[model samples]
Target: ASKVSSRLLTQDILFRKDRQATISLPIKLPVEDIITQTCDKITYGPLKFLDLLEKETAVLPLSTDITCPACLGRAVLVGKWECPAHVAVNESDLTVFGPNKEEHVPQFVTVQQPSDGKMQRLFFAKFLGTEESLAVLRVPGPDGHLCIQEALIHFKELSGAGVCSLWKANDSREEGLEMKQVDCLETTVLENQTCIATTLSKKIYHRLYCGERLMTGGQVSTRVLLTALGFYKRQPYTFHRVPKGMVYVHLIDSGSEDYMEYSECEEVTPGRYEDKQISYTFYTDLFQTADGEPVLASVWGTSGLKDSAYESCAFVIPTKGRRKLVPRRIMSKCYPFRLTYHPSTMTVRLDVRVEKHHGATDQGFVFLKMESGTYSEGREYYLDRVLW
Candidate 1:
């Protein structure tokens, strides 16, 4: 309703006499919307099993007669028990038998809807790099079928996501199960392979192998977040990893704690494998110089009126995928960001020095320079404007 430092919010590409560079330096945002708003493409969460049905996508291929598996033409499955259960999809011919009924293509996936009834396997997907395959499990009802259909869409669209194979204790115990150290994410579920699973407790609980392997039991569940790779991307360069979703204030380094956003990062930590967790919070850069040195420019002084009234500009608040945010957190100058080389790690080290500014005006500007360093010569990325 009113207006919006986005300590520096919006970003623009510039053309100067020198070079062409990218935007998105650094800024703050409310952790509340970080996970949701930051990631744009991840439109929907996991599909529901209720609204859809057994024959929706992957057919059940079960008998309408409810006949026994013991005999081809029998009435009961003895005590109503029965039946059992790959590919990056090298699509081939398949059939069911008693499962033979509809004629299926088990060529890909562990082989969908095998008649055994208990051993369920639907569709399997091949992720770009992993050696193993990711497969969806068949829960009790209709949802399993459509889930596979949705999965095909995910792979079809190249929508990247991780598939987790749910695992459960075979007998009534998980503690006494024999296991190896490296295999477990520290659980009965082993990572090396399902082959290491010994004793009868380790059976084909689900007919799938993926890393892209193994599961215990129950309905399949996975968590996905919409992240621009890393908006945790920028904020962390101060010390370490900042995510697109809420910053871990405690996870933040010393001297970096004061740069807090209202409703921003807090000390409350999430589980290691919680929503939107990622590698050392990577940041994006503009390395190409196709048209010559570009002057990336923007006008800051647009902090909240009260804050802007004092002295404020914009900080390229990493939000909505490297987009800008209004500048709020005040600063005088933090510069000469040395984009240099690191021989040991075999990578470039972006060494930055922050000098807080308490000047009278909400000034905005930008430049690049460095001190004595014979190891790596430097004249790095400079995006202008603002007084964040």
Candidate 2:
């Protein structure tokens, strides 16, 4: 009966240990850790903790053990491939490795950080030679595959750094070598390391969950919002008030089929007139052009502001009624203006000044200086008044 009990404990007593289950088994048996081909599964034989400590010499365990060098945990084998006890990289996580387009071949090796005592991931390239004594390995760099002739040089220097490596790449991984391991209670000394700046070619922007929509890092066009708000289905019109003149001229258009031109002028009282049907608002202003053209410049209202003056400014007009004017804030070489339409006050405030240099025609090069955030504020302006 005792012999049968011992056999049962050795063959059937496959127990997994945790913080609460640190109880030692009475049986003395040599355990083997085994890992699978795909490095996904692991199996361990029965273990006697006291017996393992009695051995004085170090013998590396077999790859079949699926052992984690960092945490010293064994993976439980469930499939044909032996998985490691450490964190496994999924398909999506693997994409981050080849960001610069180099095909990354997954390797089942891991190293731990001395600072936090945590295991980190390690990988090799698909095209690398299988010789273990190779002095150099292709590492992902800022530009891409940064070829390091003597990889051991960087490894020796990084023997004790927080981050083992930094890698980013362009469209392909074959283009370059780009830009990690280890622990025990054993201390590693790192010194005399030269820092090389990794030039990141692009900035990665993540999508944020805001309100009910996925908000990205860039600005959304007002025309898109206008379409959502049913602005495009209605007529497009613009109104212009001549500089230093009382008459407000109307500009009309036939959708995208026709362009806005001079229609008519009318004198009206100083108040607000808005057409909610077509999202049209008119702001009365007075200004003249550079061609000695004494023209009424009534700024229009639209969210689709111009990024540069070189682009054609769209002015929508209603063929039959009062047209909307595109919002225009006055420009200055030293005092560029900011116009914001205050719906509560039913007025526009213009006090912000940005440096702008619209160059002269005679080979004159004026450095057009504007605030970095000025472009998204609204379209280019010509007069002082906000139209929303």
Candidate 3:
């Protein structure tokens, strides 16, 4: 191994003096370096059902609902039909009666019928906000070294107005479904922040209402997959609706005698209405700051490089939400990722921005800035560095 210096110094390194001011280290990490080192190690692609589970820190309850009417003895169903509870409902033409047997209750009951099987209700959540971004821009060799000859951090601000909606699917395939517009919500992000900085804006608490609501045949299946896989082709999903029962995972019963996680969110009960509506929200911001006023900070160079770097960051806050959300698509306006490092504290912050474009005018989006972690070099955020 080569000899290492314990106490080395260079005129280029200066002791930070101003407390109000922050440090913006010049770092150059070429795209090729990232492609070569982390391209395969980090899959850049869509989201799948499994990815959503990893994204959810907690599970909020759905609205309370009506249990299976057949199991509740509210109606007498006489048919050797298939059971939705069964994996192969088409193959199981069995008849069930009474409550003696575990599966004896009519699993085929619907919301129209007053059976023990329940309908799902709405779920709600309020995402909490923090004060810093959580993204990082790691250069190949070191934290502040420039790998590329020229680098720049250029950014563009985007704004859109839209609305929220509650869509109900028709029971019959031949029947046309109906969609009702819900009250639009607001979205915001830290000014001079990166798209990724906006992503970790805050912790959103979700509430689920599994009450006496109409239960569609395959609605839960769709929701289950959504909650698990998130939106489309796939990546981690975002929750935008207000959950039922105003559920806060930290406040919910996890494993106490009074609460059952698996039974509540997993093995659903009949007569138990457990349906709810879901929402979507996404926004992003990427920015940089320099020593003082004159310094310009940008997200991209002339050709997406370091030479064209700026000495400033950014800010984003919309006043509305998307009315029609496409399945599995990221709601952010674009540029939802960032990277930087603190000089004194030696902390790195990576920020991800998220937003939903509704194309409306009523409800506006709210955004704020935040740090990724406590570790730092003088409370510096990942905004110091850059990422592709």
lDDT winner among the candidates? 1
Model 2 scores worst on lDDT over the 10 consecutive residues at 222-231
- Model 1 CA lDDT for position 245: 23
Error of 3 at 56 (Å): 22
Tens digit of per-residue lDDT, candidate 3, span 254-349: 234564332332111112111221121112121122121111111211112344322222211111233211111112333433434343443333
Q: Would you list the rank order by TM-score, best first?
A: 1, 2, 3
Best by TM-score: 1
The C-alpha lDDT values of all candidates are 0.19, 0.18, 0.18
lDDT of 2 by residue, 1-388 (tens): 2222111100011111110111112211111111101111111122111111111111111121101112111111111112234534242222111111122323434444454665533333221111110111212212122211111001100011000111111213211121101121112111211111111111111122111122233221111000000001222374422111011111122245363242221211122222211111222221111121111111222212332221111111111223222222221121222333343444333332212322222111111111111111121222122222
TM-score to native of every candidate shown = 0.16, 0.15, 0.13
lDDT of 1 by residue, 276-345 (tens): 2211111222222112222121111222224323211112222122222211111234232223322234
User: Model 1 — TM-score against the truth?
Assistant: 0.16
Candidate 1 stretches with Cα past 4 Å from truth are: 1-124, 129-164, 167-388
Candidate 3 local lDDT, residue 13: 10
- Candidate 3: where are CA atoms >4 Å away? 1-363, 372-388
lDDT of 3 at 332: 34
